[PDB]
Design a protein around this ligand. Structure first.
Ligand SMILES: [Mg+2]
Ligand SMILES: [Mg+2]
Ligand SMILES: [Mg+2]
Ligand SMILES: [Mg+2]
Ligand SMILES: [Mg+2]
Ligand SMILES: [Mg+2]
Ligand SMILES: [Mg+2]
Ligand SMILES: [Mg+2]
Ligand SMILES: [Mg+2]
Ligand SMILES: [Mg+2]
Ligand SMILES: [Mg+2]
Ligand SMILES: [Mg+2]
Ligand SMILES: [Mg+2]
Ligand SMILES: [Mg+2]
Ligand SMILES: [Mg+2]
Ligand SMILES: [Mg+2]
Ligand SMILES: [Mg+2]
Ligand SMILES: [Mg+2]
Ligand SMILES: [Mg+2]
Ligand SMILES: [Mg+2]
Ligand SMILES: [Mg+2]
Ligand SMILES: [Mg+2]
Ligand SMILES: [Mg+2]
Ligand SMILES: [Mg+2]
Ligand SMILES: [Mg+2]
Ligand SMILES: [Mg+2]
Ligand SMILES: [Mg+2]
Ligand SMILES: [Mg+2]
Ligand SMILES: [Mg+2]
Ligand SMILES: [Mg+2]
Ligand SMILES: [Mg+2]
Ligand SMILES: [Mg+2]
Ligand SMILES: [Mg+2]
Ligand SMILES: [Mg+2]
Ligand SMILES: [Mg+2]
Ligand SMILES: [Mg+2]
Ligand SMILES: [Mg+2]
Ligand SMILES: [Mg+2]
Ligand SMILES: [Mg+2]
Ligand SMILES: [Mg+2]
Ligand SMILES: [Mg+2]
Ligand SMILES: [Mg+2]
Ligand SMILES: [Mg+2]
Ligand SMILES: [Mg+2]
Ligand SMILES: [Mg+2]
Ligand SMILES: [Mg+2]
Ligand SMILES: [Mg+2]
Ligand SMILES: [Mg+2]
Ligand SMILES: [Mg+2]
Ligand SMILES: [Mg+2]
Ligand SMILES: [Mg+2]
Ligand SMILES: [Mg+2]
Ligand SMILES: [Mg+2]
Ligand SMILES: [Mg+2]
Lengths: 134, 263, 158
RNA sequence: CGACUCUUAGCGGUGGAUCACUCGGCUCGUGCGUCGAUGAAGAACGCAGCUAGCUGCGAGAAUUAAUGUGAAUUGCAGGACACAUUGAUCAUCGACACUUCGAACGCACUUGCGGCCCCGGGUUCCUCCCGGGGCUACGCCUGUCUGAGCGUCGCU
RNA sequence: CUACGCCGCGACGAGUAGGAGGGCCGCUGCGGUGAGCCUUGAAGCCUAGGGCGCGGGCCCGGGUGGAGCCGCCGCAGGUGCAGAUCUUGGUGGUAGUAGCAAAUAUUCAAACGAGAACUUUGAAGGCCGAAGUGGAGAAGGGUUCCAUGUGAACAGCAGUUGA
RNA sequence: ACUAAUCGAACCAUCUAGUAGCUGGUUCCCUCCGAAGUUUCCCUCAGGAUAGCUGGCGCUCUCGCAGACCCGAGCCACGCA
RNA sequence: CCGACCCGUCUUGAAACACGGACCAAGGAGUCUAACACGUGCGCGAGUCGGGGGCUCGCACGAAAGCCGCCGUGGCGCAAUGAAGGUGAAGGCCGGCGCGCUCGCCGGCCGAGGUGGGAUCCCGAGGCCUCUCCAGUCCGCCGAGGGCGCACCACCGGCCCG
RNA sequence: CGCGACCUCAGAUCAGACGUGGCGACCCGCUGAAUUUAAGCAUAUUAGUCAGCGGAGGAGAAGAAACUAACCAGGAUUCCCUCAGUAACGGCGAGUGAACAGGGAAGAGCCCAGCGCCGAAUCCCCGCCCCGCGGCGGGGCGCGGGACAUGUGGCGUACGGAAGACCCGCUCCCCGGCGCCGCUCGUGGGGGGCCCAAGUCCUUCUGAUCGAGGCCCAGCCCGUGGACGGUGUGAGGCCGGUAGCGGCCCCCGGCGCGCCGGGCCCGGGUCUUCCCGGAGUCGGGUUGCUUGGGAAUGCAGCCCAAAGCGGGUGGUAAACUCCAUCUAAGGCUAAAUACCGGCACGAGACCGAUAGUCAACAAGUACCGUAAGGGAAAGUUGAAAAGAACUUUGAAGAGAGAGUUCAAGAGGGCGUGAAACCGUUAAGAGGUAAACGGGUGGGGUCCGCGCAGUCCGCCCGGAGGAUUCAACCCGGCGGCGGGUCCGGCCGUGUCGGCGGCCCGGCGGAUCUUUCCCGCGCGGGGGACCGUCCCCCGACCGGCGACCGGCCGCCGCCGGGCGCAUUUCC
């Protein structure tokens, strides 16, 4: 279990940190697993969610294999919006249903130089850990 | 509680000729608080009766001889299968209750090999019972960080650490204990004797030097010897059925004489 | 009010004692901090003894305790003078000195000077420049024989 | 037969008890243990596209720069942002900036009014008006300059 | 035959202040334990439902509720309420009652408007009667000033009016 | 008289939870035992101490413990009122 | 149908024309520290106690637990008495001696005296036995008397200090 | 009768600096009550406390004896334990109340004035040059100013010191960088940033699930990671994290070597000759306060007013006398210690929205008072606003439908939703106010699977089935007994110690070299004794509840045979 005397296991403190986190670490909190194919291709497990990547929902009312592009990462409410994950409201207009990024799986990443750099950094750390624990 | 709690009001009693109780009332006006009772244990927002204080004498000192006596009692009870079963430790396939393993266990490094050792020692059922017992606590401990509760598992007693603590310690219920630093709070977890204990061979051998024989004083405690029995033979059945006891007895009066209805 | 037999008790709790109450909840923390300071000091003075300077043999003053003997504050200047140690070099080489202590009798004087001579025999002195051993000690007896001493130096024993 | 009243029950009101929760306290412990004339603490007034409070900030005003991070902020709108002829947001924060009172410092205030030295303009050097900048508190230390004394003397 | 158990016989039974014992009476939290209970429904609450105990109280059925809870062995208390002109909050009867009575007074028609005793306009009858119920300031207030709109709340009736 | 609805000593905060032999209140059940308003002393007479009355904890002893159903086989306990 | 005054409280006396109480919910009052005394439970026991300190991966628990022993300093107990100077708790028998003078010198023994009670324990004449007897083998029960007497009580001696 | 030097003063918006105010939990210096207790009350107590004033720092204060003691003597300060509720004070009442010694935490010592010597050797400021900037320093230059003989610096301070000789030893200091190690170290030294294991597998529950069942190989996978939090429940494996002397990057600080710039000046012992101390201070009287300090503990005011083989202290005032102890009236100093304020953390047998801070929330807010000051109430829709489109009556509030949702019998003060109180419906009743206890009766709502009334052991009779019933054979396993049959042993003794201070331990207030290193004066090493230790073996008791092997008996089970007057359903 936890042995570091400078990290707290207090429930109230952890909840306060989580709900008052600034956006630059809310990004890390709002991470999503990669698919099996992406996990095999890049030696990484999880990835922070991004505006223009394609995910599929694995829990809740919108379970299925349909692949939808993210259209909004609403970090204030800790949710993301996906293309066809939406519902009709009373007056006939469609509103996006926000779902937690931990309940989706990323099937295709929106890749630029920064995402690539983070990918090799995570893969390198994982490889170092495997070689240390071999 | 705060020593200032309920006593930072400057309230005073209104007197007696105003048709209200003589409790102190908050002074001033223009707010709900004005004219409300203060300073009393019966008043809302007042001071509690006999406020709790930090000098409660939280700690108790116990005689060293009594603490050693309790350690000896816990160890003696840990070798009796009825008492460990009555603590509910699931010892039905354990080959020998004073369970002693070779010193190779002290050098274990991974958790997988500790799990394998428990499985081969047939002590894995106690761990499975702990797993089954992992549930959610009832009451305020959930808000006070005692969120989860579980069954106590076996106690691995070791002499020297060469990685055994790291190999274990991810197994729920397993408690590791150094033989030179035996803890009664771990040997009798609820105050009840009979915790299942798995001994390393070197710890088992060091027990004699730690607590002594009845013929040897303890060589690692410099003044301690094992306590004495006030009843050498506790087998009441055999004592009572011994012929020398039986010859001295009068015959039993086994007829019931119920009351006679007076005709 | 008194009630039957009892002891006449005089509690000293008439003086607002609850403003001045010293709790001891920081006692384990204080012990930890003192132990850490001891270990840090011992690491700082690496080969030098952890407890510090050698102390003299000293008889306890009153008639209750004059049969016992203990450790004093520092060696007297008469002891250092007849032992051949400068009073300004003794502190450098680790000998506590007490300029205000006198020697009324000769037996205590001689005991303390044999103590000083024994300490000087057991002392290992490192040269200021390790590459240039001037007058301290041979490197053979300071390579591996140098070791930090735990406990008081030459503890005083009755 | 009704009304009314009482008791009981169903349902509905009034009310917010109970229970469950908790980004709050209380207590203990640990490590540091740092304000200010280079203008503190405190106060006032302002600052957002839509903004009253709280929060943040100071006319560069819900923030500038720099560094880290790496695609948002979001209630609505707007507009950036090839993330490489460099970057949203957030964090850090070492550069810069920091209105008026306040020890508060030109004098004074439930108001207002000066003086000195430069710069620009109306003037067309000469000093009147206007604007801008810098100074103008008390105590005290070392030194400097200017002095005072029928204080002590020297020369005349 | 849980020997802290079981069985037998005899006598006895008032009780304030007070003392003691027992409590498988009750509340909250901690160490153990129940391979305990629980979204196939926890706590809480409601109940002309079935019962148990001398009693404190407890178990079960039905409903509501929507996430936690309990038994046993020990441990520890901010642990049990009808009162204190008790504290805080809420609610009755009183009771559709007292009352909406100081300074003479209103009426007609029309307009707007869903709606007019009270608004507006016109007509009439009155009052203040220049030491005013007139016209303007000081102190104090601080936007109450002015126009437009609304009819929630407020203006102790109302309002289409209003500080 | 007046000194901000306060005056034979204002108001505010604190010492302060001031003291009270005086008034009011003092929270579950059953079982067992169960009073005193009297003595003495006290600036004592609405209060205490003291003895008495009460409860609890015991301890030291006495009669024996009888016949496995059953069946006694001058003399019948320490001591007390 | 019979019985039945409103509770709490102070009081000799409450249904009182004595006080508080309109109703409901929640809160609401012998607590903690210190010091004594006695009782009970536990450990050790002429001792007992580490509580302050120190040593142990410094720390999930663990601010716990374990250990110290030339860390027992110290506290309490093991000695009392007197204002104090100070002093400070062993006797009984058999003897030979001065003079066994109401006492001085030693031996041999034993080791806190004696009386009256005193749970318990010990001895115990004599009894209880079978199909019966003259003749003893082994032990069980009752038992008048007698003995050693725990604790404790009453008393008489003795010893220490003023 | 002017000009200069000094002295003592003044001015300046002079050149360059410094102080002010805040906080104030802890600390230092003062001032300082009364409530209260004494069952009244005045001394006393409360208490040197609250309030008041001033001054600091990360600690402060204190502090290296004008000390304690009376001993075989200790040896700065501070803190802890104890001394000790003691000595003592006290209407000797209530009450108050230290210190020394002892054991610990920490441990660190020093500097002036004076007396002296040294050609003022000394210091500040301003210009110039160079090396540097990062807190403003170093070096050099100035017939550049000033301070200073009314006294700067070096040596030196009570532990004595200085100067001369005689002898001995050359012994090695600190300061800021250049490059890099051991990498600073309980395993990074600190600060910051980014990362690092394993199920969203199969079947199911649900509104959603993190629930339930399973995952062949000893068992899904990881585990040095099964803390915690989030996620539509309840998650080690979904995510962040967690573990790890795990990784990478950036910055900062101190540790050794060779060099760099410069300083840096002799130390000890013996003898001789010299030199040595703080004054309106001590002390004394008196007064007031304070203390446990009592014929006066400390502090202060006033008066008196010192000495130098002197002075202070030696807990009863005084005289004489001996002794002990220190050296006042100048100064600095870390650590151990304190901390209800501040910055940043961690935790809890604490509280859980009338509780816990007054404040879980736009709380020191709203509001009140001229002011000082006083000071609240107030948490919860839902997983997601999906926050009710649209139709309809009304002027609207408000309704009826419809719709979302698992649920609006969750509809923006919306989780649950008690009691008091109220409306309506249903049932019953009603002139001694209601209400209550005991006893019945009537009605009603419910309950009893009430409604042909239990079961089950043996036997008899009837009508059907089936392995197989008993006894024997083989195998397994138990229970009991056995001279110990055979071991393994176990308890208590008993022998020779072959067995251990080299080749078994630990202790002794037991004797020693008459073999070994310190003055006829220690530490070692030996012998003995007590407990031992494992052993070589034997005798006594026993197989014990410490176990095995052989037999003997019994019992059970499995497989055969037994297939019918047995056995069972
Ligand atoms: Mg409170
Ligand atoms: Mg609960
Ligand atoms: Mg209702
Ligand atoms: Mg920027
Ligand atoms: Mg004016
Ligand atoms: Mg002159
Ligand atoms: Mg009774
Ligand atoms: Mg209470
Ligand atoms: Mg109530
Ligand atoms: Mg009326
Ligand atoms: Mg009227
Ligand atoms: Mg008129
Ligand atoms: Mg007018
Ligand atoms: Mg108007
Ligand atoms: Mg109205
Ligand atoms: Mg009061
Ligand atoms: Mg009375
Ligand atoms: Mg009364
Ligand atoms: Mg009366
Ligand atoms: Mg009554
Ligand atoms: Mg009457
Ligand atoms: Mg009356
Ligand atoms: Mg009364
Ligand atoms: Mg009344
Ligand atoms: Mg009331
Ligand atoms: Mg209550
Ligand atoms: Mg400990
Ligand atoms: Mg002693
Ligand atoms: Mg006797
Ligand atoms: Mg006598
Ligand atoms: Mg100037
Ligand atoms: Mg009094
Ligand atoms: Mg009184
Ligand atoms: Mg009085
Ligand atoms: Mg004060
Ligand atoms: Mg200041
Ligand atoms: Mg200081
Ligand atoms: Mg000082
Ligand atoms: Mg000195
Ligand atoms: Mg004592
Ligand atoms: Mg005092
Ligand atoms: Mg020490
Ligand atoms: Mg000089
Ligand atoms: Mg992960
Ligand atoms: Mg969760
Ligand atoms: Mg989890
Ligand atoms: Mg880590
Ligand atoms: Mg004297
Ligand atoms: Mg509150
Ligand atoms: Mg609530
Ligand atoms: Mg309306
Ligand atoms: Mg519902
Ligand atoms: Mg609701
Ligand atoms: Mg109803």
């Amino acid at each position: 279990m936890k042995f570091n005397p400078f990290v707290t296991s207090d429930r109230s403190k952890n909840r306060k940190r989580h709900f008052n986190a600034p956006s630059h670490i809310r990004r890390k909190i709002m991470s999503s697993p990669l698919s099996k194919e992406l996990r095999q291709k890049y030696n990484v497990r999880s990835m922070p969610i991004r505006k223009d990547d394609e995910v599929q929902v694995v829990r809740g009312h919108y379970k299925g294999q349909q692949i939808g592009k993210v259209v909004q990462v609403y970090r204030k409410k800790y949710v993301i919006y996906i293309e066809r994950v939406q519902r009709e409201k009373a007056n006939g207009t469609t509103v996006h249903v926000g779902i937690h990024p931990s309940k989706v799986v990323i099937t295709r990443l929106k890749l630029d130089k920064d995402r690539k750099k983070i990918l090799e950094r995570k893969a390198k750390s994982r490889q170092v850990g495997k070689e240390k624990g071999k | 509680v705060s020593e200032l709690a309920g006593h930072q009001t400057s309230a005073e009693s209104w007197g007696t000729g105003r048709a209200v109780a003589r409790i102190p009332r908050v002074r001033g006006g223009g707010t709900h608080r004005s004219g409300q009772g203060a300073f009393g244990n019966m008043c809302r927002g007042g001071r509690m009766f006999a406020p709790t204080k930090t000098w409660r004498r939280w700690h108790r000192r116990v005689n060293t001889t009594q603490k050693r006596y309790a350690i000896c009692s816990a160890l003696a009870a840990s070798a009796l299968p009825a008492l460990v079963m009555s603590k509910g430790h699931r010892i039905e396939e354990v080959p020998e209750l004073p369970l002693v393993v070779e010193d190779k266990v002290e050098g274990y490094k991974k958790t997988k090999e500790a799990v394998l050792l428990l499985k081969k020692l047939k002590a894995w059922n106690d761990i499975k019972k702990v797993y089954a017992s992992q549930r959610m606590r009832a009451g305020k401990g959930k808000m006070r960080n005692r969120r989860r509760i579980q069954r106590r598992g076996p106690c691995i007693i070791y002499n020297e650490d060469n990685g055994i603590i790291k190999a274990f310690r991810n197994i729920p219920g397993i408690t590791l204990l150094n033989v030179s630093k035996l803890n009664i709070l771990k040997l009798a977890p609820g105050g009840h004797v009979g915790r299942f204990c798995i001994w390393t061979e070197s710890a088992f051998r060091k027990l004699d030097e730690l607590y002594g024989t009845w013929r040897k004083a303890a060589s690692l405690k410099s003044n301690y010897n094992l306590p004495m029995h006030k009843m050498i033979n506790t087998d009441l059945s055999r004592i009572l059925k011994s012929p020398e006891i039986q010859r001295a007895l009068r015959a039993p009066r086994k007829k019931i004489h119920r009351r006679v209805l007076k005709k | 009010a008194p009630s039957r037999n009892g002891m006449v008790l005089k509690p000293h709790f008439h003086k607002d004692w609850q403003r001045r109450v010293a709790t001891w909840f920081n006692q384990p923390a204080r012990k930890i901090r003192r132990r850490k300071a001891r270990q840090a000091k011992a690491r700082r003075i690496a080969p030098r003894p952890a407890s510090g300077p050698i102390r003299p043999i000293v008889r306890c003053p009153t008639v209750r305790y004059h049969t016992k003997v203990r450790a004093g504050r520092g060696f007297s200047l008469e002891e250092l003078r007849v032992a051949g140690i400068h009073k300004k070099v003794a502190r450098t080489i680790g000998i506590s000195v007490d300029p205000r202590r006198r020697n009324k009798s000769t037996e205590s004087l001689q005991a303390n000077v044999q103590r000083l001579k024994e300490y000087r025999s057991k002392l290992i002195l490192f040269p200021r420049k390790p590459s240039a051993p001037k007058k301290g000690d041979s490197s053979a007896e300071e390579l591996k024989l140098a070791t930090q001493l735990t406990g008081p130096v030459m503890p005083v024993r009755n």
